Amino acid sequence: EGEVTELTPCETENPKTISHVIIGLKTAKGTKQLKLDPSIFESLQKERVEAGDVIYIEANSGAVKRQGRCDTYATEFDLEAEEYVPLPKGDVHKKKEIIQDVTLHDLDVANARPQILSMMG
Amino acid sequence: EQITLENQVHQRIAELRKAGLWSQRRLPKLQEAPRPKSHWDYLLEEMQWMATDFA
Amino acid sequence: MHREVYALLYSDKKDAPPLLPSDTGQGYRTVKAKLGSKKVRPWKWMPFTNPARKDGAMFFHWRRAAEEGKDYPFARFNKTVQVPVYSEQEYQLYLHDDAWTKAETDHLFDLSRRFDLRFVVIHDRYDHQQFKKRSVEDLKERYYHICAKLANVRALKIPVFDAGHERRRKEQLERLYNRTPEQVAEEEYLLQELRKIEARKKEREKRS
Amino acid sequence: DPDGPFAFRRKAGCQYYAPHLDQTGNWPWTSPKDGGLGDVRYRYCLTTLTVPQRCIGFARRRVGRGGRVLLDRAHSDYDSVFHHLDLESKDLSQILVNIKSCRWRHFRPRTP
Amino acid sequence: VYGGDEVGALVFDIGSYTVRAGYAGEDCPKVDFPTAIGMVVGPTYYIDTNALRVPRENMEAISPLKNGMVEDWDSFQAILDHTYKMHVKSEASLHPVLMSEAPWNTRAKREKLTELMFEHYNIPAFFLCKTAVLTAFANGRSTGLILDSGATHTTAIPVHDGYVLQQGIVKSPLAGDFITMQCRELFQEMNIELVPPYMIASKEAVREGSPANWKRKEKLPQVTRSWHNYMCNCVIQDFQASVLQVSDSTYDEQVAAQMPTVHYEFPNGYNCDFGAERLKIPEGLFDPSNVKGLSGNTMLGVSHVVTTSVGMCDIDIRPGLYGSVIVAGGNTLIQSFTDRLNRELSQKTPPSMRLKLIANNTTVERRFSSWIGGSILASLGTFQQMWISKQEYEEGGKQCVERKCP
Amino acid sequence: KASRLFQPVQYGQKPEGRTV
Amino acid sequence: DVDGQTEVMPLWTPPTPPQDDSDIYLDSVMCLMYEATPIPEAKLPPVYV
Ligand SMILES: Nc1ncnc2c1ncn2[C@@H]1O[C@H](COP(=O)(O)OP(=O)(O)OP(=O)(O)O)[C@@H](O)[C@H]1O
Numbered sequence: 027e028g029e030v031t032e033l034t035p036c037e038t039e040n041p042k043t044i045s046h047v048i049i050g051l052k053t054a055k056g057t058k059q060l061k062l063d064p065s066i067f068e069s070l071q072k073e074r075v076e077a078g079d080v081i082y083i084e085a086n087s088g089a090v091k092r093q094g095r096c097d098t099y100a101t102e103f104d105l106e107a108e109e110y111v112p113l114p115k116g117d118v119h120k121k122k123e124i125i126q127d128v129t130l131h132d133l134d135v136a137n138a139r140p141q142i143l144s145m146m147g
Numbered sequence: 148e149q150i151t152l153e154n155q156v157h158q159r160i161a162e163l164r165k166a167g168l169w170s171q172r173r174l175p176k177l178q179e180a181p182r183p184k185s186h187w188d189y190l191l192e193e194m195q196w197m198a199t200d201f202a
Numbered sequence: 203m204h205r206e207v208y209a210l211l212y213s214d215k216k217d218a219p220p221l222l223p224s225d226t227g228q229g230y231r232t233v234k235a236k237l238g239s240k241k242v243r244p245w246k247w248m249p250f251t252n253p254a255r256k257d258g259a260m261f262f263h264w265r266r267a268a269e270e271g272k273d274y275p276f277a278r279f280n281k282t283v284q285v286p287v288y289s290e291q292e293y294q295l296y297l298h299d300d301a302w303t304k305a306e307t308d309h310l311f312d313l314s315r316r317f318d319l320r321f322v323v324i325h326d327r328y329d330h331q332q333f334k335k336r337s338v339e340d341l342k343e344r345y346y347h348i349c350a351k352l353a354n355v356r357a358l359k360i361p362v363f364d365a366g367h368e369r370r371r372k373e374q375l376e377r378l379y380n381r382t383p384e385q386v387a388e389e390e391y392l393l394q395e396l397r398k399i400e401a402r403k404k405e406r407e408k409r410s
Numbered sequence: 411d412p413d414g415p416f417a418f419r420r421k422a423g424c425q426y427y428a429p430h431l432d433q434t435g436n437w438p439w440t441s442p443k444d445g446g447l448g449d450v451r452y453r454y455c456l457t458t459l460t461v462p463q464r465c466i467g468f469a470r471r472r473v474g475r476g477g478r479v480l481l482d483r484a485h486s487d488y489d490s491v492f493h494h495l496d497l498e499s500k501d502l503s504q505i506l507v508n509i510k511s512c513r514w515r516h517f518r519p520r521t522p
Numbered sequence: 523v524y525g526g527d528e529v530g531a532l533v534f535d536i537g538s539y540t541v542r543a544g545y546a547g548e549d550c551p552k553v554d555f556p557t558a559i560g561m562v563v564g565p566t567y568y569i570d571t572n573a574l575r576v577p578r579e580n581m582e583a584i585s586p587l588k589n590g591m592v593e594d595w596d597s598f599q600a601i602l603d604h605t606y607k608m609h610v611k612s613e614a615s616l617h618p619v620l621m622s623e624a625p626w627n628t629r630a631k632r633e634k635l636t637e638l639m640f641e642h643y644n645i646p647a648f649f650l651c652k653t654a655v656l657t658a659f660a661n662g663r664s665t666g667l668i669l670d671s672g673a674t675h676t677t678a679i680p681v682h683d684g685y686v687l688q689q690g691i692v693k694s695p696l697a698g699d700f701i702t703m704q705c706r707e708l709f710q711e712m713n714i715e716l717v718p719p720y721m722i723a724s725k726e727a728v729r730e731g732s733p734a735n736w737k738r739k740e741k742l743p744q745v746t747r748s749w750h751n752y753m754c755n756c757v758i759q760d761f762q763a764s765v766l767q768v769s770d771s772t773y774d775e776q777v778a779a780q781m782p783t784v785h786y787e788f789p790n791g792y793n794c795d796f797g798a799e800r801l802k803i804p805e806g807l808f809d810p811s812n813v814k815g816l817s818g819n820t821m822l823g824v825s826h827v828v829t830t831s832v833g834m835c836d837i838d839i840r841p842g843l844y845g846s847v848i849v850a851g852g853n854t855l856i857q858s859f860t861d862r863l864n865r866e867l868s869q870k871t872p873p874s875m876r877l878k879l880i881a882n883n884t885t886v887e888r889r890f891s892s893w894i895g896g897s898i899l900a901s902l903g904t905f906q907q908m909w910i911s912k913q914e915y916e917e918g919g920k921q922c923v924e925r926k927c928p
Numbered sequence: 929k930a931s932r933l934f935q936p937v938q939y940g941q942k943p944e945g946r947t948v
Numbered sequence: 949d950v951d952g953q954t955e956v957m958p959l960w961t962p963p964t965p966p967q968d969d970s971d972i973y974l975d976s977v978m979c980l981m982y983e984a985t986p987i988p989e990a991k992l993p994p995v996y997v
Pocket residue numbers: 536537538539540541590671672673674675698699759762763764850851852853854855856885889
C-alpha cells in the first residue's frame with residue numbers, strides 16, 4: 027500500500043509490447059517501486075488509479091484496489107469525503123495478521139441464509 | 148607451593164608499596180577551594196560549541 | 203552493539219550529515235501563502251557598546267533595528283575569579299615571609315588574576331629568571347596561605363591547603379610514570395596473579 | 411609501614427578525590443562504558459521524525475549559529491535496521507528485544 | 523546567551539610555506555599564496571603565484587619569515603598590502619584583524635607586529651593568538667598536545683585550558699625543508715637532472731630511464747639562483763606529495779622492496795620507478811640516527827619529540843596531553859605518517875594513560891587548522907572582550923600587547 | 929489577490945487588517 | 949521508560965549566562981585521574997597526629 031507516484035509501463039521487443047508495469051508507491055516511511063505483472067494494467071484503468079492516488083495491492087491475486095486521493099492533495103475549498111484518505115503510515119509492503127473469533131453456530135447462520143431474493147428476504 | 152607463591156607475592160607487593168610503585172593504592176587529590184566559572188571557562192565552552200558547529 | 207553514541211565534533215568520517223531545518227522543503231508552491239502573508243523585520247549593520255570592555259570601543263553587529271542600543275548580552279559572562287587585594291601596610295603586617303619577596307608575591311598574584319587561578323599556567327608563566335624558582339605547590343601554598351590570612355584578618359572559613367600531601371602525590375605519580383615497560387608489565391602480571399589466587403580461594407570457600 | 415612512605419593522612423578541614431582504579435578516566439564527551447563522564451549534551455540517541463515518519467538513527471539536538479536547531483547524526487553499522495525501526499533477522503530480533511525491554515533510549519517528538 | 527557574534531573580523535595565518543587569510547566565520551581560508559616572494563632591487567615585490575611563476579631578470583626569491591618568525595618587516599608589509607588589496611578588497615581600518623603567531627615568538631617581535639598593525643594599517647582592533655591554541659580550538663579541544671610539522675620546524679606544543687605551555691615546547695629541525703633536501707640528494711645520487719617546468723617548451727614521451735627528449739624555451743631571460751632553487755623546491759615538494767610514504771613500522775629493506783613501486787613522471791618527461799627509496803626518506807623524521815647527514819647528531823624523532831614535550835609538563839596535565847594528541851602541518855600529510863606515529867606512540871606511551879589521535883587526516887584540516895581555530899575564536903561573542911582596541915594601544919602603548927594577549 | 933488589498937504584516941506583529 | 953517516567957532529549961545550546969555563583973568550575977583534566985565527587989567522611993581515614 028502507498029500513494030502512487032508513477033505508473034510507467036515497461037516497453038520491450040516481443041521475443042508496442044510491455045513486459046512489466048512499474049508502480050511507485052509512497053508512504054510516510056519511504057518509496058518503493060514494484061515490477062508488477064503487465065496484466066495489472068486492466069485493473070489500474072478499471073479502478074481509475076492515477077498519480078497521487080492511495081492504493082493497496084494484495085500479494086496473492088495481484089489486483090489493485092483504490093482507496094481515494096491522498097490527503098496531501100486535498101484543499102479546504104473542495105467538497106468530497108470518501109475520495110480523500112491520509113497517506114499510509116508504515117512500510118509500503120505490509121504483512122497483516124487478522125484474527126477473528128467465531129462459533130460454529132455463527133458459521134451455521136452465515137451459510138444458512140447468505141446476505142432480488144436478498145431484497146425480498 | 149601455593150603457600151610459597153602467596154607469601155612471595157605478598158612480600159613483592161609490600162616491597163613495591165614501600166617503593167610506591169603500587170598503582171592500586173594511589174594517593175587521593177586534595178580538593179581545591181571551589182570557585183565559580185570564569186569568563187575564560189565560558190569562552191572555552193562557547194569555543195567547543197562553535198567548533199562543533201563548524202565541523 | 204552500542205546502546206548510545208558519544209562524540210565531540212562528530213563520531214566518524216562515515217557520519218551522516220546533520221539535518222538542517224528549513225521551510226519550502228516540500229516545495230515553494232505549498233508555502234507560497236505563508237511566506238507571502240508576512241514581511242521580514244529589518245536587519246542593520248550597527249555599532250554596539252560592550253560594557254565588559256573598559257575602553258568603550260564600538261564594534262559592529264548584524265542585528266534587528268529594534269535591538270539597537272540594547273545592552274550586549276555576552277557581557278553577562280564577564281566575571282573574574284575573586285582574588286584579594288592587599289596594601290603595602292597589610293603585607294608588611296601579616297603577609298611578610300622571609301622565604302618570599304614582596305615583589306615576588308605581587309607577581310604571583312598578578313599571574314593568578316591573569317590566569318584565573320590556573321596554577322599550572324601560572325607555573326608555566328612564572329618568571330623563574332627574575333624571581334627564585336618555585337614549584338606549583340609552592341605557588342598554591344603561598345596563595346592559599348595569603349588568602350586564609352587575609353580572610354581571618356578581615357572576616358566564614360575556607361579549607362586549608364596541604365602542600366605536603368600534594369607533593370607526595372606528584373612524587374608518587376612521577377615514580378609510577380617513569381617506570382620501565384618491564385616494571386609495569388610486572389605490576390600487571392602481579393595484579394592478574396593475585397586475582398587468580400583470590401579467585402581460587404573464593405572457589406574453595408564457595409565449595410565449603 | 412609499607413604504605414607509610416606514601417600513606418594517606420587526613421587533615422582537619424580537608425576533602426579528597428578518590429583515584430580512578432576500576433577504569434581509566436576519559437573525556438566528558440565519551441561514553442561511561444569508555445571511562446567518560448557521558449555528559450548528556452554529547453550523547454547520540456535514536457530519533458524519529460514527523461516528516462518522514464521514519465527513524466533517522468542516532469541523533470543529537472544541537473543549536474546552530476543563528477539559533478537554528480540542528481540534528482547531528484552518527485553513523486552506525488545497523489543504520490538500515492534503524493531505518494526499518496518504528497512503532498517498537500537475528501540482529502533485528504536482538505535489536506527489537508533490546509528496544510522492547512527499553513534498554514535503548516529512543517526519543518519521539520510530541521507537541522508541548 | 524546566544525550563538526557567537528560575527529563582527530566582520532579578519533583572520534591571518536602567515537606561515538613559512540603559504541600565507542593563509544580569510545574572513546572570520548568561514549570554514550576555510552579564502553586565500554593561501556606562497557610565502558616566498560619575488561624581489562627586484564622600495565624594491566618591487568612579486569608576491570602571488572601568478573607573478574612568482576613567470577621568469578624575470580634580477581628577481582630574487584626571499585621569505586619574510588625566519589625560523590617561524592618574521593625577520594624582514596618590509597616584505598611583511600608588502601605581503602599584507604597584497605593580501606588586503608587583491609584578496610580582501612576591503613579597507614584595513616574597517617575590519618578587526620586576528621593573527622596567529624609562533625609559540626616561541628619573542629616579546630620584541632610581538633611589540634613590533636602590534637606597532638605595525640596599529641600605526642601603519644590603522645586597524646580598529648587587533649589580537650595575536652598562538653598557532654597551537656588555534657589548532658586546539660579548531661578541534662573543539664581546550665587542552666591537548668599540538669604536533670605541528672610545517673616547512674621550518676617540527677614542534678610539539680602542550681596546550682592547557684587554551685594556553686600554550688611554553689616550558690613544554692620541543693622543536694626539531696626535521697620538517698618539509700629537510701625532506702626536500704633529502705629528495706634533492708636522492709635525485710643527485712640518481713643523476714636525475716631537475717628541469718623546472720618554466721624551462722620546458724615541449725616534451726615527448728620516453729621510456730623509463732630513457733634520456734629526456736625536451737625542447738628548451740627560447741628567449742628565456744637570466745634568472746637569479748634563488749628563483750631557480752625555488753622552482754626546483756616546488757617540483758621537489760610535488761614529488762614529496764605524490765610519491766613519498768611513511769613505513770607502517772620500523773624501516774626494513776626487505777619489506778620495503780617487497781611492496782609495489784610507485785611511478786612518477788618529472789616535468790621534463792623523465793620517468794622512473796622509485797622502488798624502496800621512496801620509503802627511506804620519510805623514515806628520517808622518525809629515526810634520524812640513520813640519516814646520511816649526521817648519524818651521531820642529537821635530533822629527536824617526531825615520536826620522541828612528542829614524548830619529550832609531554833614529559834616536561836606537570837604530570838597532572840599529562841593525562842590530558844596524551845588523551846588529546848592533535849596532528850597538524852603539511853608535512854604530516856605524507857602517506858601512513860599518522861598510522862606510523864600512532865603505532866610508535868602507543869608503543870611508547872605508558873599503559874596507565876589513554877592515547878588518542880584525533881582523526882583529522884585531510885589536507886584542509888591539517889594545513890589550515892590554525893586558521894580554522896582563529897575563525898572560531900574570532901566568531902565567539904565572549905571573545906569580543908579580548909580585542910585590543912586602538913584606544914587601548916594609544917593609552918597603554920606598544921607594551922599593551924604583553925598583558926592583553928596571553 | 930490578498931497582496932493587492934492588504935498590507936503584509938511584519939513578523940512578530942499581530943495582524944490587524946490594514947489596507948493599501 | 950517502563951515505569952512511565954518521561955525524559956526530554958538534551959539540547960546542546962550555547963552557554964547560558966550565570967545568574968549567581970552556583971556555576972561551580974570543574975577541572976576536566978583533573979577528572980581524568982580522580983572522581984568528581986569528594987570522598988564521604990564515613991570512609992575517610994581518621995586524622996593523623
Ligand atoms: N599532501 C602533502 N604531502 C606531503 N607534503 C605536503 C603535502 N601538503 C603539503 N606538504 C608540505 O607541507 C610543508 C609544510 O606546509 P604547511 O602549510 O604545513 O606550512 P606552514 O604551517 O605554513 O609553515 P611553517 O610551520 O614551516 O612556518 C610544505 O613544505 C609542503 O611541501
